[PDB]
């Protein structure tokens, strides 16, 4: 039903633009359509919500900042953050309800910030049952995605948080198979960084 | 700006164990809202207008409270339950949330599995050369790791992170990343990764020699 789409990093002083793309239902029609983000640490703060009847209430403290217009034709509605901070990072979630019922969408990562993008580095990690490894080093911003074969791999997947030194993260992630499947076939971590556009996969060889 | 405190920050519970955590705001709030989040995924309303259950919500689930003091119980704990729970004022602008209690499942004890990983070659390449261990499906959560280098304890370039509890066998991961330079790397032939925990009173070491 709602998908958060938007930029990944923004510097500080921009404005801050998101979009939420609402399918299977009419923001028109019915329930509060809100956007609402959880700062690294957990804490959750609700910014506002526009009305279906193209109506607004926004957070008294965000009030001169904030702006949420919606495209009835188009079916989404959006956010716009003025003179944002590095206080503004957070996970930003689009959301409709009607105090009887609640939808939620999968929330988009916002990092406000003037350090520099730069790419991953992939490293496999390589030694009846086998773990093996990937590190994702020295990039910036969060997020990355990783997935095993594809996915096929999910469970005995570890992908751990990754860790802010310097203004670079650095990731890893485990994945545990049978000495039945390895190295008799291979293993590969699919590594993506979508801020810089970077996709990698690397095979693990022993 | 109004303050929700929830209480106990953390807890634990085994399956079958009756819950309860409470909200106590700094003023008073006519109602409240209740969110479970589990890790990985967005907040959902379990709880509304205090003591209302959305559909879909199971009734071992019940919320009560007034003033200033509300509380969330589960009549008795299932291992889905474990997720971190928000409660929430919508009397004031700003709808201020509280900080969470986050609901963690008891299980059995296990020792973790403990894999150490040596610099890759294209890693080398870069002048740089960093050495990973893994200590995976481990519970309690409470752990220790130590990096040691030809014997002696080195404690510079470690980055530590943590995973959440696991959601089909509730136990926890960690991983520890040393980075040295390749020079540094070079200069010393023994890797060591020495994990403590309480399942064990020596800890668990895994090594390699360069
Ligand atoms: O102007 C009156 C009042 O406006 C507020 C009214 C209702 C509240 O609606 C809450 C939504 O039910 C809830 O939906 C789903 C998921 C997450 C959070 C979302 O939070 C909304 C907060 C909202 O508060 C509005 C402003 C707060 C007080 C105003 O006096």
């Known amino acids: 039903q709602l998908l958060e789409s938007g930029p990944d990093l923004v510097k500080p002083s921009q404005s801050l633009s998101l979009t939420c793309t609402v399918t299977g239902y009419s923001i028109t029609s019915g329930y509060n359509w809100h956007w609402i983000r959880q700062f690294p640490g957990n804490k959750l703060e609700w910014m506002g919500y526009i009305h279906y009847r193209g109506t607004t209430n926004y957070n008294t403290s965000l009030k001169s900042r904030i702006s949420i217009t919606r495209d009835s034709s188009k079916n989404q509605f959006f956010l716009q953050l003025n003179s944002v901070t590095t206080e503004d990072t957070a996970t930003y979630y689009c959301?409709?309800?009607?105090?009887?019922?609640?939808?939620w969408g999968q929330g988009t990562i916002v990092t406000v910030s003037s350090a520099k993008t730069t790419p991953p580095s992939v490293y496999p990690l390589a030694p009846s049952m086998v773990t093996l490894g990937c590190l994702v080093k020295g990039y910036f911003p969060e997020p990355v995605t990783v997935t095993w074969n594809s996915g096929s791999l999910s469970s005995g997947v570890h992908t751990f948080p990754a860790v802010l030194q310097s203004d670079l993260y650095t990731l890893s992630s485990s994945v545990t198979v049978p000495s039945s499947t390895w190295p008799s076939e291979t293993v590969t971590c699919n590594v993506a960084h979508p801020a810089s556009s970077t996709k990698v996969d690397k095979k693990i060889v022993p | 700006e109004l303050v929700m405190t929830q209480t106990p920050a953390i807890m634990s519970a085994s399956p079958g164990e009756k819950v309860t955590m409470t909200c106590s705001a700094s003023?008073?709030?006519?109602?409240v809202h209740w969110y479970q989040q589990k890790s990985g995924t967005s907040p959902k309303r379990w709880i509304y207008?205090?003591?209302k259950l959305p559909s879909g919500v199971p009734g071992r689930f019940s919320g009560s409270g007034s003033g200033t003091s509300y509380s969330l119980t589960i009549s008795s704990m299932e291992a889905e339950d474990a997720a971190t729970y928000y409660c929430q004022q919508w009397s004031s602008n700003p709808p201020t949330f509280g900080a969470g209690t986050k609901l963690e499942v008891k299980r059995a004890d296990a020792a973790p599995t403990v894999s150490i990983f040596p610099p890759s070659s294209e890693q080398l390449t870069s002048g740089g050369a960093s050495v990973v261990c893994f200590l995976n499906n481990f519970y309690p959560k409470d752990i220790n790791v130590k990096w040691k280098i030809d014997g002696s304890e080195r404690q510079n370039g470690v980055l530590n992170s943590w995973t959440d509890q696991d959601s089909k066998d509730s136990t926890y991961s960690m991983s520890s990343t040393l980075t040295l330079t390749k020079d540094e790397y070079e200069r010393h032939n023994s890797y060591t990764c020495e994990a403590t925990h309480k399942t064990s009173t020596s800890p668990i070491v895994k090594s390699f020699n360069r």
């Open positions: 207008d205090t003591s």
């Open positions: 003023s008073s709030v006519s109602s």
């Open positions: 959301a409709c309800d009607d105090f009887y019922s609640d939808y």
